Amino acid sequence: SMSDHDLKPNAATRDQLNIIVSYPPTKQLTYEEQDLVWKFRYYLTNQEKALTKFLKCVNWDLPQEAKQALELLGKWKPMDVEDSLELLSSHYTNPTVRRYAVARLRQADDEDLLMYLLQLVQALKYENFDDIKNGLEPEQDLCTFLISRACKNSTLANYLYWYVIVECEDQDTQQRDPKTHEMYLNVMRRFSQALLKGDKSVRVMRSLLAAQQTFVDRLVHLMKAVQRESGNRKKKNERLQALLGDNEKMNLSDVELIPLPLEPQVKIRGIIPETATLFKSALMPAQLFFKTEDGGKYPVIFKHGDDLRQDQLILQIISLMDKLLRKENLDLKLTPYKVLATSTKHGFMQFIQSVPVAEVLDTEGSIQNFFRKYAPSENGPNGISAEVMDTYVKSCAGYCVITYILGVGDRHLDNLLLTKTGKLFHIDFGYILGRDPKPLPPPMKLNKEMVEGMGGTQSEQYQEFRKQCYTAFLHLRRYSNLILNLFSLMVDANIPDIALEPDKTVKKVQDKFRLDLSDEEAVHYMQSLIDESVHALF
């Protein structure tokens, strides 16, 4: 009767709690709201979604409140994976809470865990550094949990190795935050130590990590020699090919099967010497074809003297977004090509056969001419195969929405690529979150050429495009908590456009969701965006 156990909100209080619980994870609760959540804490234990709000209400400095908070945490209806990500941010230091996050995160399968791993490696920054160190030879934390899943899953192990090694080689971290640099060095050692206690298969997996590392080391050596060559591009290409061709010297053309770092499920036995060339751009990245196990080939870009990490983040988010859309039965024919940094200054990208829209205009005059040339169909829309046009409309819609949310700038027509199957996709994420090389970038990154490709503002393709934009936008809004919680874990990352304003990064994504609007209003807003953009184009 003086107890809180049985307090029961009326209809009006329930409606106010439902508002508070439905807030996005970034919304700061007022003192009034905090008091209200606390008051009906026992009532809220039936709501998994109320737990993150509850934990934001605890005065941790009051021993009384802290103990009861942890009692309730144990009794709460269990938190979902997407929400556990919030507990791994810099806001939470409480050991029990952080371990609870891991306990709930463990419920994810390996497929989902891989979609979040990049962020989870950043989140080690917010863990107990002493505990990580003390686990070295003289209820899991995050470090123990990741290593434990990696020991049992060679894909996870592969990405854990590379994500952590890049952190280990970050000279910015080393100079600016030596304790954090030291922590990542300890994670690597903890991972090695764990692998060495494993069975024979795990010890072999470990040795194949090492074999990848030395393969990349040798590729770095090769690129230094090529980039230092005095002569023209043809001479550099000859030197690139000769060095690749000399397996005795460089051990790059024929090696024992190792996982491709970029895609570890694909095993490779070296690089084809004679088809390796440099791109005609200032930093001289190479196009390399890998020899795959089944006798096939896998083209990549290997960049040296260039930081891929912003592109790595964005392609990892695009991958996530595509997966979420597919989860809701929407396949918009996207191209989330792989990107993996092997250091702060080099890395791999998956090369997709394609043509820049600039070159399409130059060689064929328009996107539609391109399609009519390569996919003619007498009775298809504007003489184009229906499947191809369908793929074009879908992929256009998908990228329209995704680049809008991510604030992707520098959208010149060499950064929009097209395939002959009709896929359009974006590359080159050097400007994100509203940045652009020229002033006043538009909210939506649509161009005349793209609209004309689908037959103009008077076609049914155009209507299908707008519809697909609406649908994609509503689906991605439904995953706003997940997406925002993932960006929250990136705030301290050495990624240029985040590091400009760490504290405003998440807001810049969140605003694009227009969470303040209902689904009906959201559709209207998106319609209005597309109309305004396209109107301004003509």
Ligand SMILES: C[C@@H]1COCCN1C1=CC(=O)N=C(N2CCCC[C@@H]2C(F)(F)F)C1
């Ligand atoms: C890898 C992805 C997907 O497959 C197609 C090419 N793509 C590109 C992505 C990217 O960010 N930049 C690219 N270009 C190519 C034009 C010259 C500059 C630059 C690079 F890498 F060569 F330096 C290409």
